[PDB]
Amino acid sequence: GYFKIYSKHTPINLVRDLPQGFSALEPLVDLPIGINITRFQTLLAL
């Protein structure tokens, strides 16, 4: 019943492929919802 979020931003100047390197993820907010989640869709500004 908890929704964990982790985020990390890296300042690496690689063009396209996923960088070959190691970097951890820190927790942002562990908030309760208590509701099942089954689908996912993203939003981009237009």
Place this chain on the structure above:
Amino acid sequence: LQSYGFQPTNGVGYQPYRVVVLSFELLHAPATVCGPKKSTNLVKNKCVN
């Protein structure tokens, strides 16, 4: 829906009571509403509990 009117000269029983019931819902989600928590002063160099 009949009228519910009052005057200050009304006696006990006819005096209106403002009633609030603090009901609650539990056991269907992780607990989110709790009470206050005690805070005490820390102690150094003495083995405490």
